């Protein structure tokens, strides 16, 4: 009864995928083989081109991504051949290295073996391959609260953080057959970090803020043609607002606005002074400036919105139905200064796509 679910989403996928590549004729005799393969193996295997394109189509259908203009330039690394922890670790190490590309960030996705009978071959515990640890115990609040439960879960595994505000979490994943995950501390040479400075406010460095260069999501499930690549970490570059308006700004994250208001020489006393709004802007100016000063790829929300408009234009031209999540597409900084705010989008889910999956810890 599963071989009809997998088959009907494989009919849809192959037909559409080969249609876009100009291989519509090759559809019929590829579908046939799949029907055979599914029947006799319970599943089927993608070609280099199907997987590569299917992962680009998945990015294209992400309603919450504002950076989908470059969906076709996605660098797809095929690691469906890995069988050991050392291969997975080194694949993850390589991904970090190639995606970072000395700072000229390259949108990349490493794809590991998909679920067989729903069973995960690999099971990545990291939300991102590079993320800061978080600790809270006895009134103490160190690091990133978002990473509190994974951190505690790592410290149940022999790992121990230095309890600075920017402890790199180790890579932690579990292989099929094993009861517990392994962890590997990250080589620092593989991780670029950016110290946040202001272009004209020298006191800003006293905050000692920094962030990591490359955002590599590693807990989402790639679904391509009925096949579940539960482990397929991908990355883009940062939009400045993700760091300056959320990660470093949220009260339930790094909560830096009052400190920012202090170093920029304004009071944080009255709402009518709009001190949070002013601190948000100066902090966000500092983030973009700090990245471009170091030579790490980053985009501002305005430039990103322009690009997304081109994506909309490009979509209508190709007769492609556009889908988007308005609530996630609008930037948390001056959303009304972008075209996104003033129009609506269809939040319909089209496959291939990236999905949430249940965490293994907590």
Ligand X SMILES: CNCc1cc(OCc2ccc3ccc(N)nc3c2)ccc1Cl
Point out the residues that are catalytic. 65, 68, 237, 242
Residue 226's Cβ-side half-sphere holds a number of Cα atoms within 13 Å equal to 21
Q: Pick the closest to residue 183 from 295, 89, 51, 273 (CA basis).
A: 89
x-or-dash pattern for ligand X, window 226-255, by CB under 6 A?
Answer: ----------x-xx--x-------------
Give 267: exposed, middle or buried? Use CB within 10 Å, 0-12, 13-18, 19+.
exposed
Closer CB to a second copy, 54 or 324, in the complex: 324
CA distance 196 to 259: 14
- Residue 348's contacts (CB-CB under 8 Å, 6 or more residues apart) are 63, 323
Least Å from the CB of residue 73 to ligand HEM: 9
Which of 114, 215, 244, 324 lies at the binding interface for ligand X (CB under 6 A)? 215
Indicate which of ligand H4B, ligand X, ligand HEM, none lies near residue 107 (CB less than 5 to 8 Å, by partner kind): ligand HEM
Classify residue 192 by its DSSP letter. Answer: -
Out of 43, 61, 62, 121, point to the residue binding ligand HEM (CB under 6 A). Answer: 62
- The CB-of-263 to a second copy minimum distance in angstroms stands at 17
Dihedral angle over CA of 89, 94, 97, 98, nearest 10: -150
Closer of 196 and 220 to ligand HEM (Cβ): 220
Whole-angstrom Cα distance, residue 130 to residue 228? 24
Residue 185 vs 346, nearer CB to ligand H4B: 346
- Rounded CA-CA distance 69/296 in Å is 20
> In degrees to the nearest 10, what's the CA dihedral of 113, 99, 74, 150?
50
Tell me if 271 contacts ligand H4B by CB under 6 A: no
Q: Does 66 bind ligand HEM (CB under 6 A)?
A: yes
Of residues 323-342, those binding ligand H4B (CB under 6 A): 327-328, 341-342
State yes or no: residue 220 binds ligand X (CB under 6 A): yes
- CA dist 232 and 220 (Å) reads 7
Give the residues lining the site for a second copy (CB under 8 A): 245-246, 249-250, 257, 271-274, 276-278, 280-281, 284-285, 288-289, 292, 300, 302-303, 326-327, 330, 332-337, 341
Q: How far apart are CA 97 and CA 245, in angstroms?
A: 27
65 is in an annotated binding site: yes
CB of 316 to a second copy, least distance (A): 21
Residues making contact with ligand X (CB under 6 A): 215, 217, 219-220, 236, 238-239, 242, 356
Q: Specify binding-site residues for heme.
A: 65
């Amino acid at each position: 009864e599963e071989k009809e679910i997998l088959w009907n989403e494989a009919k849809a996928f192959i037909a559409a995928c080969y249609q876009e590549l100009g291989k519509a004729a090759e559809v019929k005799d590829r579908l046939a083989d799949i029907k055979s393969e599914i029947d006799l193996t319970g599943s089927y295997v993608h070609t280099k081109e199907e997987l590569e394109h299917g992962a680009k189509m998945a990015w294209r259908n992400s309603n919450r991504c504002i950076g989908r203009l470059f969906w076709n330039s996605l660098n797809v690394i095929d690691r469906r051949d890995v069988r050991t922890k050392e291969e997975v670790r080194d694949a993850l190490f390589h991904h970090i290295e190639t995606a970072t590309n000395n700072g000229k960030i390259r949108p990349t996705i490493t794809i590991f073996p998909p679920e067989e009978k729903g069973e995960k071959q690999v099971e990545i515990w990291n939300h991102q391959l590079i993320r800061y640890a978080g600790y809270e115990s006895d009134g103490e609040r160190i690091g990133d609260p978002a990473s509190c439960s994974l951190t505690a879960a790592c410290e149940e595994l022999g790992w121990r953080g230095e309890r600075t505000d920017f402890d790199l979490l180790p890579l932690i994943f579990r292989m099929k057959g094993d009861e517990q995950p392994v962890w590997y501390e990250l080589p620092r040479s593989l991780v670029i970090e950016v110290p946040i400075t202001h272009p004209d406010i020298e006191a800003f460095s006293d905050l000692e803020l920094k962030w990591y260069g490359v955002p590599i999501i590693s807990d989402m499930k790639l679904e391509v043609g009925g096949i579940h690549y539960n482990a397929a970490p991908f990355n883009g570059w940062y939009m400045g607002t993700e760091i300056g308006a959320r990660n470093l700004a949220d009260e339930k994250r790094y909560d830096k606005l009052k400190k920012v208001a202090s170093v920029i020489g304004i009071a944080a006393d009255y709402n009518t002074d709009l001190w949070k709004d002013q601190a948000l802007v100066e902090l966000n100016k500092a983030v973009l400036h700090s990245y471009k000063k170091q030579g790490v790829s980053i985009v501002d929300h305005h430039t990103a919105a322009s690009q997304f408009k081109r994506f909309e234009e490009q979509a209508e031209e190709a007769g492609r139905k556009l889908t988007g999540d308005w609530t996630w597409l609008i930037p948390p900084i001056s959303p009304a200064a972008t075209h996104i705010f003033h129009r609506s989008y269809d939040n319909s889910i089209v496959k291939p796509n990236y999905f949430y999956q249940d965490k293994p810890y907590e």
